[PDB]
Enzyme design. Structure first.
Site, PDB file in Angstrom:
ATOM      1  N   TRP A   1      20.715 -14.800  33.488  1.00  0.00           N
ATOM      2  CA  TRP A   1      21.490 -14.591  34.708  1.00  0.00           C
ATOM      3  C   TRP A   1      21.271 -13.149  35.165  1.00  0.00           C
ATOM      4  O   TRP A   1      20.778 -12.316  34.408  1.00  0.00           O
ATOM      5  CB  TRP A   1      22.992 -14.853  34.484  1.00  0.00           C
ATOM      6  CG  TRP A   1      23.570 -14.081  33.336  1.00  0.00           C
ATOM      7  CD1 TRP A   1      23.927 -12.747  33.312  1.00  0.00           C
ATOM      8  CD2 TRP A   1      23.833 -14.588  32.033  1.00  0.00           C
ATOM      9  NE1 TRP A   1      24.407 -12.414  32.064  1.00  0.00           N
ATOM     10  CE2 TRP A   1      24.374 -13.527  31.266  1.00  0.00           C
ATOM     11  CE3 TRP A   1      23.694 -15.849  31.441  1.00  0.00           C
ATOM     12  CZ2 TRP A   1      24.773 -13.693  29.925  1.00  0.00           C
ATOM     13  CZ3 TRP A   1      24.099 -16.018  30.107  1.00  0.00           C
ATOM     14  CH2 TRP A   1      24.633 -14.945  29.370  1.00  0.00           C
TER      15      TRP A   1
ATOM     16  N   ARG B   1      19.422  -8.299  25.973  1.00  0.00           N
ATOM     17  CA  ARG B   1      19.158  -8.861  24.642  1.00  0.00           C
ATOM     18  C   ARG B   1      20.357  -9.068  23.694  1.00  0.00           C
ATOM     19  O   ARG B   1      20.198  -9.690  22.669  1.00  0.00           O
ATOM     20  CB  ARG B   1      18.091  -8.042  23.944  1.00  0.00           C
ATOM     21  CG  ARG B   1      16.702  -8.231  24.548  1.00  0.00           C
ATOM     22  CD  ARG B   1      15.696  -7.358  23.802  1.00  0.00           C
ATOM     23  NE  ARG B   1      15.794  -5.955  24.200  1.00  0.00           N
ATOM     24  CZ  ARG B   1      15.174  -4.964  23.579  1.00  0.00           C
ATOM     25  NH1 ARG B   1      14.470  -5.196  22.448  1.00  0.00           N
ATOM     26  NH2 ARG B   1      15.296  -3.732  24.060  1.00  0.00           N
TER      27      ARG B   1
ATOM     28  N   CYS C   1      13.998  -5.445  28.159  1.00  0.00           N
ATOM     29  CA  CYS C   1      15.115  -6.329  28.513  1.00  0.00           C
ATOM     30  C   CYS C   1      16.430  -5.772  28.055  1.00  0.00           C
ATOM     31  O   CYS C   1      16.650  -5.580  26.853  1.00  0.00           O
ATOM     32  CB  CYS C   1      14.943  -7.761  27.970  1.00  0.00           C
ATOM     33  SG  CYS C   1      16.368  -8.852  28.301  1.00  0.00           S
TER      34      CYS C   1
ATOM     35  N   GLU D   1      19.408  -5.804  40.195  1.00  0.00           N
ATOM     36  CA  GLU D   1      18.116  -6.452  40.432  1.00  0.00           C
ATOM     37  C   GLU D   1      18.006  -6.937  41.887  1.00  0.00           C
ATOM     38  O   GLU D   1      16.969  -6.773  42.503  1.00  0.00           O
ATOM     39  CB  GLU D   1      17.869  -7.618  39.493  1.00  0.00           C
ATOM     40  CG  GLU D   1      17.845  -7.241  38.027  1.00  0.00           C
ATOM     41  CD  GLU D   1      17.633  -8.466  37.153  1.00  0.00           C
ATOM     42  OE1 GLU D   1      16.455  -8.903  37.077  1.00  0.00           O
ATOM     43  OE2 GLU D   1      18.620  -8.961  36.527  1.00  0.00           O
TER      44      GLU D   1
HETATM   45  C1  HEM Z   1      20.849 -13.409  29.713  1.00  0.00           C
HETATM   46  C2  HEM Z   1      20.823 -12.583  30.769  1.00  0.00           C
HETATM   47  C3  HEM Z   1      19.658 -11.593  30.981  1.00  0.00           C
HETATM   48  C4  HEM Z   1      19.786 -10.433  31.628  1.00  0.00           C
HETATM   49  C5  HEM Z   1      21.078  -9.851  32.283  1.00  0.00           C
HETATM   50  C6  HEM Z   1      18.501  -9.809  31.630  1.00  0.00           C
HETATM   51  C7  HEM Z   1      18.239  -8.599  32.228  1.00  0.00           C
HETATM   52  C8  HEM Z   1      16.970  -8.103  32.411  1.00  0.00           C
HETATM   53  C9  HEM Z   1      16.602  -7.026  33.280  1.00  0.00           C
HETATM   54  C10 HEM Z   1      17.592  -6.253  34.193  1.00  0.00           C
HETATM   55  C11 HEM Z   1      15.297  -6.816  33.118  1.00  0.00           C
HETATM   56  C12 HEM Z   1      14.405  -5.805  33.867  1.00  0.00           C
HETATM   57  C13 HEM Z   1      13.856  -6.732  34.951  1.00  0.00           C
HETATM   58  C14 HEM Z   1      13.277  -6.030  36.132  1.00  0.00           C
HETATM   59  O1  HEM Z   1      13.753  -4.920  36.449  1.00  0.00           O
HETATM   60  O2  HEM Z   1      12.344  -6.602  36.748  1.00  0.00           O
HETATM   61  C15 HEM Z   1      14.777  -7.770  32.171  1.00  0.00           C
HETATM   62  C16 HEM Z   1      13.463  -7.874  31.758  1.00  0.00           C
HETATM   63  C17 HEM Z   1      12.957  -8.780  30.840  1.00  0.00           C
HETATM   64  N1  HEM Z   1      13.679  -9.812  30.235  1.00  0.00           N
HETATM   65 FE1  HEM Z   1      15.770 -10.009  30.272  1.00  0.00          FE
HETATM   66  N2  HEM Z   1      17.575 -10.614  30.971  1.00  0.00           N
HETATM   67  C18 HEM Z   1      18.267 -11.733  30.544  1.00  0.00           C
HETATM   68  C19 HEM Z   1      17.706 -12.810  29.882  1.00  0.00           C
HETATM   69  C20 HEM Z   1      16.434 -12.903  29.381  1.00  0.00           C
HETATM   70  C21 HEM Z   1      15.850 -14.064  28.735  1.00  0.00           C
HETATM   71  C22 HEM Z   1      16.543 -15.417  28.478  1.00  0.00           C
HETATM   72  C23 HEM Z   1      14.603 -13.740  28.392  1.00  0.00           C
HETATM   73  C24 HEM Z   1      13.575 -14.639  27.663  1.00  0.00           C
HETATM   74  C25 HEM Z   1      13.965 -15.441  26.653  1.00  0.00           C
HETATM   75  C26 HEM Z   1      14.351 -12.388  28.868  1.00  0.00           C
HETATM   76  C27 HEM Z   1      13.215 -11.655  28.670  1.00  0.00           C
HETATM   77  C28 HEM Z   1      12.854 -10.559  29.408  1.00  0.00           C
HETATM   78  C29 HEM Z   1      11.524 -10.009  29.418  1.00  0.00           C
HETATM   79  C30 HEM Z   1      10.300 -10.526  28.607  1.00  0.00           C
HETATM   80  C31 HEM Z   1      11.596  -8.813  30.361  1.00  0.00           C
HETATM   81  C32 HEM Z   1      10.398  -7.901  30.766  1.00  0.00           C
HETATM   82  C33 HEM Z   1       9.931  -8.483  32.114  1.00  0.00           C
HETATM   83  C34 HEM Z   1       8.762  -7.729  32.701  1.00  0.00           C
HETATM   84  O3  HEM Z   1       8.221  -6.805  32.033  1.00  0.00           O
HETATM   85  O4  HEM Z   1       8.337  -8.049  33.827  1.00  0.00           O
HETATM   86  N3  HEM Z   1      15.478 -11.903  29.475  1.00  0.00           N
HETATM   87  N4  HEM Z   1      15.841  -8.555  31.755  1.00  0.00           N
HETATM   88  C1  JI4 Z   2      15.055 -13.796  32.419  1.00  0.00           C
HETATM   89  C2  JI4 Z   2      15.436 -12.691  33.375  1.00  0.00           C
HETATM   90  C3  JI4 Z   2      16.780 -12.359  33.592  1.00  0.00           C
HETATM   91  C4  JI4 Z   2      17.060 -11.322  34.489  1.00  0.00           C
HETATM   92  N1  JI4 Z   2      18.334 -10.941  34.747  1.00  0.00           N
HETATM   93  N2  JI4 Z   2      16.049 -10.688  35.145  1.00  0.00           N
HETATM   94  C5  JI4 Z   2      14.747 -11.004  34.950  1.00  0.00           C
HETATM   95  C6  JI4 Z   2      13.655 -10.267  35.729  1.00  0.00           C
HETATM   96  C7  JI4 Z   2      13.256 -10.968  37.033  1.00  0.00           C
HETATM   97  C8  JI4 Z   2      14.434 -11.160  38.003  1.00  0.00           C
HETATM   98  N3  JI4 Z   2      14.480  -9.916  38.751  1.00  0.00           N
HETATM   99  C9  JI4 Z   2      13.244  -9.171  38.674  1.00  0.00           C
HETATM  100  C10 JI4 Z   2      12.306 -10.104  37.894  1.00  0.00           C
HETATM  101  N4  JI4 Z   2      11.305  -9.320  37.176  1.00  0.00           N
HETATM  102  C11 JI4 Z   2      10.282  -9.952  36.348  1.00  0.00           C
HETATM  103  C12 JI4 Z   2       8.882  -9.655  36.881  1.00  0.00           C
HETATM  104  N5  JI4 Z   2       8.567  -8.234  36.938  1.00  0.00           N
HETATM  105  C13 JI4 Z   2       7.173  -7.829  36.792  1.00  0.00           C
HETATM  106  C14 JI4 Z   2       6.989  -6.357  37.111  1.00  0.00           C
HETATM  107  C15 JI4 Z   2       5.557  -5.917  36.924  1.00  0.00           C
HETATM  108  C16 JI4 Z   2       4.732  -5.796  38.044  1.00  0.00           C
HETATM  109  C17 JI4 Z   2       3.407  -5.377  37.901  1.00  0.00           C
HETATM  110  C18 JI4 Z   2       2.912  -5.079  36.635  1.00  0.00           C
HETATM  111  C19 JI4 Z   2       3.744  -5.195  35.515  1.00  0.00           C
HETATM  112  F1  JI4 Z   2       3.253  -4.906  34.300  1.00  0.00           F
HETATM  113  C20 JI4 Z   2       5.068  -5.610  35.651  1.00  0.00           C
HETATM  114  C21 JI4 Z   2      14.423 -12.013  34.052  1.00  0.00           C
END
Ligand code: HEM
Ligand code: JI4
Ligand code: HEM
Ligand code: JI4
Ligand code: H4B
Ligand code: H4B
Ligand code: ZN
Lengths: 407, 411
Positions: B280, B111, B108, B285
């Site tokens: 947000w 953070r 993420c 994305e």
């Molecule tokens: C506040 C604005 C936030 C932004 C701009 C943001 C941005 C991102 C981005 C760009 C990714 C990669 C997602 C992707 O490419 O699919 C990500 C992943 C992630 N975010 Fe953040 N995020 C935010 C808030 C949060 C919040 C509130 C949480 C939980 C409390 C969170 C937890 C995570 C987790 C656990 C991942 C890994 C998701 C995965 O492996 O599928 N994020 N975030």
């Molecule tokens: C909380 C928050 C904020 C933010 N800006 N963005 C996000 C990720 C969301 C929205 N835009 C992409 C989506 N991504 C979260 C789900 N991605 C799973 C990918 C995946 C697939 C298969 C196996 C794996 F191990 C992992 C979350």
């Protein structure tokens, strides 16, 4: 034991068995991943030699043959006697092609078997090195029809008689620190450029001054040499649509030639082994031109384009980045100098991975380096899972010679 | 053991000690790196140590380590575990836990915001209708008419593994996908399977390109139930371009609220299988991944055509050109409608500051470079040049199997 890699765009799944043959350590552990870190005796030599000869004889389908056992005994005896051994020409060519094949950070490996290997193990002096290198340059350049090559100087002995090319690449542009505080030319080469001036080089002090070669034979002090300009193919950079682009004063050289790495074959170390292929466009257009600590031309180009440079969210940097990379590829192609774009190169690499999985049981690949520095996810490698592991023969990093050298 | 990471653009070197706290495994070994692999019941036995380590962390954070309050809490949890095979988190512990799971989320890039999370405790929920109500409130709160606020809603923890709370949706808000007989897809191809399940459950699909999916909600291990999020709660942004007037005619829109609802939240050994959380968007994305992935909306060719680009050879970089224009459009449209969004330049710059801060105050920051680096313009963002260390800390968010694969149907 068996490991699967999946491509998330195509659903194609591959099975990796080749990693089980890995001999060097990655830097990672079960507790920590170091995937993004840039740099993560007699007795010792026989297993290393044996491992290599077994690979080799297996490759020509003569594993366990008379030639094989007899070679292993000849090498064993030579190690027992001299503390080292000598590779056959055939082994040297095999080892070089395979070090390229095993280079996990190299996207251009589809080409691995076509390498021209120049044996320079009979070399004794810096003038001799200069001669070998000029010959490599002319051969590899081929008037713009680039051919991949490696020139291999004599192997390490006691380690006080090292052959080294002090240049990081054979052809690079000078960098000078200025009274102004800024930097003229390439800032990555500031240190090297000052060592050349320290040694006697009369610097033209321009923005694109081809550096001299600084060559070390047999552990001796290194010596300066100017590469014949007619051997350095350069491309003036213009844009297919923007007339003003040509006016930015930009050019680059046609031949990418890494000269500071170490070639390891069967425990023998080749500390001077310059190799060259041809550019992927982004190396010049994204990295050389647009890195903050490199030519850093982004500000200037966006200015000429009259983009909104007030807020990052207009994506002015991104828009200019694309135009610049169009201008690198068009220029090289118009001048008939070999280049590949990141789309084509990454497509070929996916095809290569597929070939290697079916024919060899795998392909070590470092995602962090394979995925291009622009437009990552619109290239197929972004969506490709990759396993990184270290196979030998290999190319390795080695300390910069100016810290090691004893004068 | 002290590990250094260097930024190759600024030469700033940082020292990691926090990795020493890491319990769990990465998937890598000394001989193989799996850094690009996407995915590399609990007894009394294992539970108390996990609980103790969590409460030690928690009581250290509030400067009460070794206090009577600390000790009495360890005792009360130990007693509760031996008596009931589990334990209940205090509200304060739950908040600390959810915030730290976000803090520890190595993939993420957002953070910097970790400590401002609004935590909704839904541990008193018993039914899917109750889940629906909690989720509506989360969405309305987080949306805040375009002024987005980070939030998480936490449903009751796993018990025997047969009574799980789950949100079957991967995100709270997403668009349906429909596979046509001719093999083309209408809407979002990522959601085809889920859309089919919804339809089978009795959802009447409008069968358009941007149909907001219903919620499919499972309480207490029961069969999941369908609910339509009230449309007035779903903030959406029509996508247009500041210079290209024809861009609006593509008919594109996107929703404002990114809300992940399929992950598992682990705190002190307890497992919260339904914990939807939202932030947000970063523009890329939507503009890069949702719109331009070949396996998603796949709009590159259509945009490049409208731009009259030379599409005969890749080296014209027509894909790259169209890509930037689409991403300008997404940012412009969100900003014009006053819906919170961050561009990849600003988000990555903020992440570097956050990471430097974390190394100094916490002794480290686990980070997954493969995920942190944006999917366009990688090396013109400062994260490209930053060495990072990836390791797993708890509390944590984890992936879990899709519920349709594991659920036992009562009918
Ligand atoms: C506040 C604005 C936030 C932004 C701009 C943001 C941005 C991102 C981005 C760009 C990714 C990669 C997602 C992707 O490419 O699919 C990500 C992943 C992630 N975010 Fe953040 N995020 C935010 C808030 C949060 C919040 C509130 C949480 C939980 C409390 C969170 C937890 C995570 C987790 C656990 C991942 C890994 C998701 C995965 O492996 O599928 N994020 N975030
Ligand atoms: C909380 C928050 C904020 C933010 N800006 N963005 C996000 C990720 C969301 C929205 N835009 C992409 C989506 N991504 C979260 C789900 N991605 C799973 C990918 C995946 C697939 C298969 C196996 C794996 F191990 C992992 C979350
Ligand atoms: C023929 C066309 C070739 C292409 C298009 C190509 C492409 C590339 C690219 C894009 C990189 C990443 C380097 C960077 O970003 O700085 C790379 C690295 C590398 N290449 Fe290839 N290459 C080619 C030929 C060769 C040859 C002939 C060899 C050796 C015989 C080779 C060995 C390596 C090695 C060892 C690396 C990693 C270098 C490092 O760690 O800095 N390449 N190559
Ligand atoms: C043979 C070949 C062909 C090709 N197209 N491209 C290449 C890479 C060359 C050219 N364009 C970039 C340069 N790259 C080679 C040197 N890379 C060193 C990076 C580095 C720095 C500091 C510490 C480290 F651990 C690592 C080689
Ligand atoms: C810190 C990070 O490892 C470093 O910036 C890497 C990232 N990926 C790269 N990829 C390539 N092809 N070349 C590079 O020099 C780098 N640099
Ligand atoms: C194979 C590879 O690990 C996979 O495509 C990853 C790469 N990096 C990513 N980075 C982010 N932020 N999101 C993703 O879905 C992915 N996909
Ligand atoms: Zn690793």
């Amino acid at each position: 034991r068996f490991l699967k890699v999946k491509n998330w765009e195509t659903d194609v799944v591959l099975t990796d068995t080749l990693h089980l043959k890995s001999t060097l350590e990655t830097g990672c552990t079960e507790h920590i991943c170091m995937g993004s870190i840039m740099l993560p005796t007699k007795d010792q030599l026989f297993p290393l030699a044996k491992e290599f000869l077994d690979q080799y004889y297996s490759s020509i389908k003569r594993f366990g043959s008379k030639a094989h056992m007899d070679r292993l005994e000849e090498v064993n005896k030579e190690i027992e006697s001299t503390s080292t051994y000598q590779l056959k020409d055939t082994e040297l060519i095999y080892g070089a092609k395979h070090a390229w094949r095993n280079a996990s950070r190299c996207v251009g490996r589809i080409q691995w078997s076509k390498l021209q290997v120049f044996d320079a193990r009979d070399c004794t002096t810096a003038h001799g090195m200069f001669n070998y290198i000029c010959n490599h340059v002319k051969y590899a350049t081929n008037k713009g029809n680039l051919r991949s090559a490696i020139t291999i100087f004599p192997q390490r002995t006691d380690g006080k008689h090292d052959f080294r090319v002090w240049n990081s690449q054979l052809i690079r542009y000078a960098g000078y620190k200025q009274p102004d505080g800024s930097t003229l030319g390439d800032p990555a080469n500031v240190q090297f450029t000052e060592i050349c001036i320290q040694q006697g080089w009369k610097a033209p002090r321009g923005r694109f001054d081809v550096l001299p070669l600084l060559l070390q034979a047999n552990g001796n002090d290194p010596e300066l040499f100017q590469i014949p300009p007619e051997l350095v193919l350069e491309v003036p950079i213009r844009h297919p649509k923007f007339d003003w682009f040509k006016d930015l004063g930009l050019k680059w050289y046609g031949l990418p030639a890494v000269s500071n790495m170490l070639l390891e074959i069967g425990g023998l170390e080749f500390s001077a082994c310059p190799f060259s292929g041809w550019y992927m466009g982004t190396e010049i257009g994204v990295r050389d031109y647009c890195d903050n600590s490199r030519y850093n031309i982004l500000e200037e180009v966006a200015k000429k384009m009259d983009l909104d440079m007030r807020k990052t969210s207009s994506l002015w940097k991104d828009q200019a980045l694309v135009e610049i990379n169009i201008a690198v590829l068009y220029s090289f192609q118009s001048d008939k100098v070999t280049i590949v774009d990141h789309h084509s190169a990454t497509e070929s690499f996916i095809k290569h991975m597929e070939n290697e999985y079916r024919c060899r049981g795998g392909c070590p690949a470092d995602w962090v380096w394979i995925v291009p520095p622009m437009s990552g996810s619109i290239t197929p490698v972004f969506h490709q899972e990759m396993l990184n592991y270290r196979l030998t023969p290999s190319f390795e990093y080695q300390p910069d010679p100016w810290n090691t050298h004893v004068w």
